[PDB]
């Protein structure tokens, strides 16, 4: 018949330390190209999770409601932000911000592209294999599938508009050091993942597959120092039986 | 608080009002619809605001006329929201440049209303359902405030224990809560926050749009035991003192809301 | 009254609605006086030609009757624009250098754009900045403020029915009244806004409601209203002064049969 | 005055399609599309702008196929768009550096994008920021303005009927006439507006009011006006100069009968 | 002539962008920008200029002959979350603070055709003498600063055809499809969006797409995403390749 399912993921900022969830490390800056050796806490990756759907015909996504979560929790200028002025409060999150999802059948299929191909990036993160001048622009070697939470850098990968036969994705970057972060709430929205011909992505395996990324700004600490804050985002996915 | 029969009978039409205040945190008796002087730079370690320095969110609950004449039959009839009109009200105060506000430079006008925003509007027929969320989870929050009880790192990005109801008018500090997407199936919200030192505050009047409140089945909230439910939050940005200090500036939001009578079963 | 069907076998009405500054001397028409800063709130005496005031203009059209049914004018559209956008291009005259051997700062900052178009005055609800403020002779303004009258205090009711009068800073229009006129407005607040206006004679905004109708010259009057402050412009001394620009209105108005 | 029906067969159908170049004062046998550097800070009381500083309305005249006297061409759609914006990727030449060892300041700040098609010239109203400035030789400006020239002066209605001497910052498109014309413009006024510009030859814009009717050509003749002031040129000293680009326009014309 | 529909391909294509290539390590990047040359002195170097970049896609002879017909397109711009690097070369925007995004003046452009693009010569500067490698307005005047009708071209050249000399041509390209937005400015934020659910429809107003005249479909991009500060202050432009998939049918036509 319909089903629905519905979860959180949550981001994957770097988290520096136990109580810095949601955060990255401190930015680096000024690494010359040659010697940029980014660590771990500091570099935020994509979310993925799996759904498991009831076994029998197959699960077709048909629509999704999606939002990100604790958008207010910025509203706090209170905590650890460097002051805007003698006297003022705290610095609003601001600058670069990237927020993306996909729903699909299968892993989100991701195309490899780096600001610098001689970044060594640090253990326990996927990154384009034997990059070339060639990876800051298109090299069609860097292919992955997003199959590990926490472990793909949001700089090293995009979803890959050549494939993504069975997954619809959405995203939008929005670069610069002052960018204000706007971001909409409503449970009234509903994205249709059908396509031309009427069909949603189907659920291969009885798997259901949900990626997000949520970088919402940079924070700046009273230091001047400055972190990425992330935000988890919220999906709720109706399926109908398909043969 | 107006609740008016436009019509009576089995097509009965019903227009609740009202202007709904904002509970920015009103430092004193004169700065109604202001929040105390912000702090800054406060470690995470040691985090403890003030009460008065935190918006909260603003709820009433509107009682309706009974329509159940006896409640011992197969259909009972409820109060169906179909659409809401609503706007933020004094919008224009804002060009007051000549009170309060530091000078832009020398010899120049007050500093306008500006930073970080945010507008928000619920109708349902229960009340809000809302998700917790902090900045810092080590935050210690001030005497009169509800806010996430035993928060964790987890509540920094999605904790599912911090579940609550909008169901105290100036207790829950916008900066704590969302509405809860994971819910509200009897309520629909709206919101858009906007960050930022320098955001421009953008607002819009008309009495001439309406917002449907009907879902894909072309059914509205439903309300509960008569009662319709209505939340807002408005902070508009940060005023600057002459000395520097800055503090939230809220206004309040007005509803009308239309109603119809739709049975249902026992 | 009862609204009954449009007489069939339409006229138009058009009017430049004058903006309302302060005019601080005869020189400086469509400007206000230099922005004073920094009063406190138990101190704040603003001057009458600092103050920007809502425009407003009563259209007098021919009574349609003789002696069941009566015919009443309706407004159907309004076409609507701001008269003299491109005057901002002037960055030679009395604006401050943007740096040594630059052009005139443009005119920027908060601005507001209203406009109301009904068959009676447009019914206004007052919100204050600070309720303690002392406004000047000349100016009507939320008598008996209180604390609530910074938020909303529902004894503020006013008619906009006196040109040059009710400061923009004090009054918006009403949402829980005006059933007989549409009105629009957009308050854009900060100190570096830039305007953006726009101008067509192919924009045209409907004035009927859900049910097809209207506002009603019940009084064989027609009403329009408006607002344009386009933003502050600074001195070469660093003194601000509000600008404002005429609003053009067309309204097409056609016959509409109700019962006595 | 009349309008009957669309007439269609064999050569009921034409486009016309031209180039309007922008005048924004040409300074200079080398500075074509450029305006004289911008002054600053002038006293309304002695504000005397240069011919050469002032950009002003492009306007052309295009023929078309002689009908005789009754059938009337009627322009029922327009591509247009600006042409060049690319060359503001020139950040080498003339321009002052963002910083040490940074490239040239990008074009940038108040910008004005208006364009007009008519079967009359196109009908301005003239509003001034300054009713005392003294406009220069070769220049069409509002006669003899007051201080009400600041806000509306009715007495200020000019067709737009000569190329390179109407200046922008002294007139607009009267929306109380041009009732044979379409026109469109946006004003963003600021000192870092970024100009944004769109270029495809998939866009339409209909010309057909209403009643489906488009701009009807008296005497088989076609009007096109254009002003695009992109921003303001920063020169390595500081001086700020006035940057303008060409506006194509394609016209599809339908004939049209009327009546007299 | 144009007949009836008579069946399908598509073809995709990743197309590199031409910002300069200063050197074998800054693939994507211009040579670091010049500032303030006079008018009368005016001479860029080849690597400091972006250049338009097209590509000829050869499709099956299929020859009243049949043409290939394009119908739609899928495009977008790969690598956009590249600039979330804040911590490779970029100067810092204050004491302590990460590095400077990419920000600044920016063109996004594409075209899909059955001919080269045709365009159209205009520059800030008539003086400027472009380097050997290029390809410019030829003979330039004052009136190549406005409209000058011999600055006609076709982009039959990738990474030739500097940016900054040329548009696409609104009185021309009969058979072609364009689309471009530039943005100007020192801080202008860049945004940029991803969707595989985003198709264009090339269709004229008679229901006819591109026809591919010589059995050859061109696509051609521009994608200067802003300028790359580093640490010294220099500036450099950031480019990022653009995907196309194209849909084509078999069109009969007369001849
Ligand atoms: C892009 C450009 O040409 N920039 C120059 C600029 C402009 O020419 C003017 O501002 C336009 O009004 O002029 C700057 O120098 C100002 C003097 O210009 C002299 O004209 C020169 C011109 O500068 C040279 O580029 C040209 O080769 O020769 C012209 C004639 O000798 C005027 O004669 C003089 O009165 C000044 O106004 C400036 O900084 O404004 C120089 C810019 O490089
Ligand atoms: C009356 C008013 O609008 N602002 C006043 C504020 C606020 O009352 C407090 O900040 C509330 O916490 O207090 C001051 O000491 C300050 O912070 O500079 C003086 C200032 O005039
Ligand atoms: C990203 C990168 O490596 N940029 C380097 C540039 C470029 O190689 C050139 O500017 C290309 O023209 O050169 C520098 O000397 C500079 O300009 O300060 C050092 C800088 O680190």
Not at 96 to 118: C, I, K, T, W
Request: proline share 7%; charged share 20%.
């Amino acid at each position: 018949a319909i089903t629905e399912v519905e979860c959180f993921l949550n981001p994957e900022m770097g988290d520096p330390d136990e109580n810095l969830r949601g955060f990255s490390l401190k930015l680096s800056a000024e690494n010359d190209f040659s010697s940029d050796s980014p660590e771990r806490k500091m570099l935020p990756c994509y979310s993925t999770a799996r759904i498991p759907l009831p076994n029998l015909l197959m699960w077709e996504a048909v629509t999704v409601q999606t939002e990100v979560i604790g958008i207010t929790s910025m509203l706090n200028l209170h905590a650890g932000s460097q002051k805007v002025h003698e006297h003022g409060g705290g610095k609003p999150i601001q600058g670069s911000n990237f927020h993306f999802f996909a729903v699909g059948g299968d892993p989100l299929e991701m195309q490899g592209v780096l600001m610098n191909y001689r970044t060594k990036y640090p253990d326990g993160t996927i990154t384009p294999k034997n990059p070339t001048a060639q990876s800051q622009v298109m090299n069609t070697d860097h292919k992955a599938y997003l199959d590990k939470n926490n472990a793909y850098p949001v700089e090293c990968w995009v979803p890959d508009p050549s494939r993504n036969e069975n997954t619809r994705y959405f995203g939008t970057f929005t670069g610069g050091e002052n960018v204000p972060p706007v971001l909409h709430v409503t449970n009234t929205a509903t994205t249709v993942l059908l396509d031309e011909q009427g069909v949603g992505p189907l659920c291969k395996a009885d798997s259901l597959y949900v990626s997000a990324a949520d970088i919402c700004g940079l924070f700046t600490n009273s230091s001047g120092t400055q972190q990425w804050r992330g935000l988890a985002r919220y999906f709720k996915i109706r399926l109908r039986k398909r043969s």
